[PDB]
Design a protein around this nucleic acid. Structure first.
Ligand SMILES: [Zn+2]
Ligand SMILES: [Zn+2]
Ligand SMILES: [Zn+2]
Ligand SMILES: [Zn+2]
Length: 111
DNA sequence: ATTTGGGGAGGGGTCTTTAACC
DNA sequence: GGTAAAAGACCCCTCCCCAAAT
């Protein structure tokens, strides 16, 4: 789509080029008025504000448990399914978060 | 000692909603 | 109201770091 004017990286996001351009300045223009923590983007600030408000918009359809984050809901759903979602293609290990599998592939030879 | 599980920050994509002009 | 954008809301991922578990 459109290339970044600075680093010439292709930004496929529709209307997301200014958002990427703001990444090069390193500033955090969004701030939580309560705990004074600064954020780069507004959506992260709202998800953080869920921490102060106590809002838990993610609902489990089987037991009604509520969570503030989508990944919390998934990791909880594995209590009903018992399924570890990420599996290594080479060493038979399984993991509960994607970055755990990435870390395993980065560290262990595995093959 | 080493591996797992999770908190909390970042970035990039898509779908919808909206702010700016006209 | 129409148009062409950016913002919002939400999805996914990785990273550092540190308890916790093994
Ligand atoms: Zn750039
Ligand atoms: Zn806060
Ligand atoms: Zn449940
Ligand atoms: Zn492996």
């Amino acid at each position: 789509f459109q290339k970044c004017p600075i680093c010439e990286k292709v930004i496929q996001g529709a209307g997301k080029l200014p958002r990427h351009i703001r990444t090069h300045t390193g500033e955090k223009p969004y701030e939580c008025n309560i705990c004074k923590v600064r954020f780069t983007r507004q959506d992260k600030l709202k998800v953080h504000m869920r921490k102060h408000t106590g809002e838990k918009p993610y609902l489990c359809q089987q037991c009604g448990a509520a969570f503030a984050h989508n990944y919390d809901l998934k990791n909880h759903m594995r209590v009903h399914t018992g399924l570890r979602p990420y599996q290594c293609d080479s060493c038979c290990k399984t993991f509960v978060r994607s970055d755990h599998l990435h870390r395993h592939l980065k560290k262990d030879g595995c093959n």
